């Protein structure tokens, strides 16, 4: 079965966990379980068309995915959690920054978040590989996979993604809330210098950047995830919770 949103309820301090483009809640589930062990509630929404056949992404848009993130914040509030940190991986880190401008958060965590909308190379190739792997997961024979990929047209989706990222980069200077910026030094999906851009251009009064030298882009599931989780916990413990 494909992943679904999760909601791990513990104490009154809550974390909204946002996944990346073509990702899903499985990329943040271990972080959610760690946060639960430490007493924090977490909710991980999923973007429209994700955890589903890749054509559903082509029929959706980043505009909807950001609304899915906002809906996740609003779901936490409806469920009784008013004090929320937003933590996002990759595109979700961009959405975490933008969400902080649209909803009241106690803090922001960005994890390998890109700055700017370059899609040529790694993002484009990653999306095609995601689609090919999904069709093999569907049990399709090789001729069917090959022919469907000949007709898979990601250009409009990647253009929308690029424009959404460009817009968020121009909003970074509006960010005010406490922030932890996390980045893998050896990221082969985005420019790791994005992390310096975020750190230097937010207007937050409380900021920290952490680099990890042995992790790849999906840092929440890779070889240093335990240290990443501990660094997130120490950030959360430093914030202005009412309880
Ligand atoms: Ca409830
Ligand atoms: Ca600006
Ligand atoms: Ca300032
Ligand atoms: Ca701090």
Author numbering: 4 to 246
Please share text taken word for word from the publication where this structure appeared:
Here, we provide the first characterization of S. aureus FphH, a conserved, putative carboxylesterase (referred to as yvaK in Bacillus subtilis) at the molecular and cellular level. Biochemical and structural investigations revealed that FphH acts as an esterase and lipase based on a fold well suited to act on a small to long hydrophobic unbranched lipid group within its substrate and can be inhibited by active site-targeting oxadiazoles. FphH is a member of the α/β hydrolase superfamily illustrated by the well conserved core structure of seven β-strands connected by several helices. The FphH serine hydrolase catalytic triad consists of Ser93, His220, and Asp190 in the usual H-bonding arrangement for this fold to enable the serine residue to cleave substrates that bind to the surrounding active site pockets.
